[PDB]
Design a binder for this molecule. Structure first.
Ligand SMILES: COc1cc(O)c(C(=O)c2ccccc2)cc1S(=O)(=O)O
Lengths: 273, 274
């Protein structure tokens, strides 16, 4: 049918949507169509989303899976010429080619740059440390702060939400002082922090080195140094499809496993002037 | 029947269209239809090729935000055909096509009326391309409110709905004009441009500047000045677009052709959020 599937959580998170843009422009570039099927990050929906695509004779499916990488569903096409390429969330490494992010290196690069700033109190706010993205990003931080003499207080929330971040930061400040360097592993985490700072200070900070995953351009309006990393949204889209159309239009299928694209760093706030 | 519906939009980078698309996918998935998406890149020539491809996929219907003028001859091929094509955002031939569209006049007036309740002497209306249908209706609504208001309103108009344009024009305007106590912008982009110069000048984003804009962004909550923003009822829109798509198909006769307008929601941000 000359059509490719893309099962993502939703067309609302900016990361997935901007990739899906450069994937439309490059799908129609080669004559193929893109059929978006959202799971709302529900494994029940994703399983059915996939099933409805097979019924539409899609030639290939790119997927950011909500289920475990190794789980009975996807091991149905473990040994199948039917290609399933993973994005952002890896699948079984021995059976599927996944294009993922370089969270560890990315965290390290961001952390190295934050370390140069002359803070005393340095706070690391993350969430769900038991998870992969959470831990990979912690290692990256520690790598760059390994032999640094300053003590970094780590603080972990129950989810990557701003509501949670508000509470946990609001509590933290009772028994700790306002930090001078901040490393947040999500943009949503940083929002929570700012909410409380706005109520406490009456104004968003001007003497604080912020470092965060995820990037909005409105961070240029801050009057403090801001460091932020974002995906190479086009570059990500190139490789996911170049693996799809390798599996279709060549005898040798691509070798399974992971492949990583680094994030870009952006200087926002006062560092943009 | 294939149980598929085409969707031709400018791009998937504009936040309006993407959020409309998100809900359209869900609404369609719930009803038992797949959604095929094709971006025109807002090029008229590309749009035509998209419609052709989508018809070879043999969809039951096509939604389109068209880059052609209403009445344009290309879309007279299906002027009077049972096959349904439902226009989104930008209207098609009102005679023989149903268009889900915003009430830019109604929204503008309502937003303007809210901006009148702040005690601001100088009131700057910044717009762009006044002669465009959209630009016009919004200015029309603004005057319907400030009809008998004794204060003077300065109407500044830019060459493009873009940030950089608004920045240059505003900073050349301040040269001879005092700093406004009230602002009305017809797009977030124009607002952005204003906020650059305010920052380059004052040193900080302001606190005593009543602001009313088209476009929305939750991050407007962080401002310490009053803010008023209008945005489409994306979900409500998405619902009503597909209702027509299906009524058109699942119901004898297509609904009354022409326009149905949907008012934006107003949100309160800055210090209005606390
Ligand atoms: C995010 O809010 C919006 C902001 C807008 O500026 C528009 C426009 O239609 C528009 C009109 C003239 C020039 C440029 C854009 C729509 C929405 S909305 O659909 O998302 O409510």
């Amino acid at each position: 049918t000359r059509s490719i599937g893309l099962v993502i959580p939703d067309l609302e998170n900016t990361s997935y949507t901007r990739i899906a843009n450069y994937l439309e422009r490059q799908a129609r570039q080669r004559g193929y169509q893109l059929l978006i099927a959202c799971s709302e990050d529900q494994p029940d929906n994703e399983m059915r989303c996939i099933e409805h695509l097979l019924q539409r004779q899609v030639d290939a499916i790119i997927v950011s899976t909500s289920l475990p990488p190794e789980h009975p569903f996807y091991q149905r096409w473990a040994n199948d010429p039917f290609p399933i390429v993973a994005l952002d969330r890896a699948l079984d490494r021995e059976h599927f080619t996944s294009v993922v992010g370089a969270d560890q290196d990315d965290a390290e690069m961001l952390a190295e740059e934050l370390r140069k700033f002359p803070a005393e109190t340095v706070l690391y706010l993350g969430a769900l440390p038991e998870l992969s993205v959470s831990f990979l990003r912690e290692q990256g931080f520690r790598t760059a702060w390994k032999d640094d003499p300053r003590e970094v207080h780590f603080l972990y929330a129950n989810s990557y939400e701003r509501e949670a971040a508000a509470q946990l930061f609001e509590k933290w400040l009772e028994t700790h002082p306002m930090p001078q360097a901040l490393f947040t592993t999500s943009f949503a985490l940083l929002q929570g922090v700012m909410d409380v700072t706005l109520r406490r200070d009456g104004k968003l900070p001007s003497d604080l080195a912020i470092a965060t995953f995820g990037d909005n351009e409105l961070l240029d309006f801050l009057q403090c140094p801001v460091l932020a990393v974002a995906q190479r949204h086009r570059d990500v889209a190139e490789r996911v499809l170049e693996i799809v159309l390798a599996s279709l239009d060549e005898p040798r299928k691509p070798k399974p496993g992971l492949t990583r694209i680094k994030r870009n760093l952006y200087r926002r706030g006062v560092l943009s002037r």
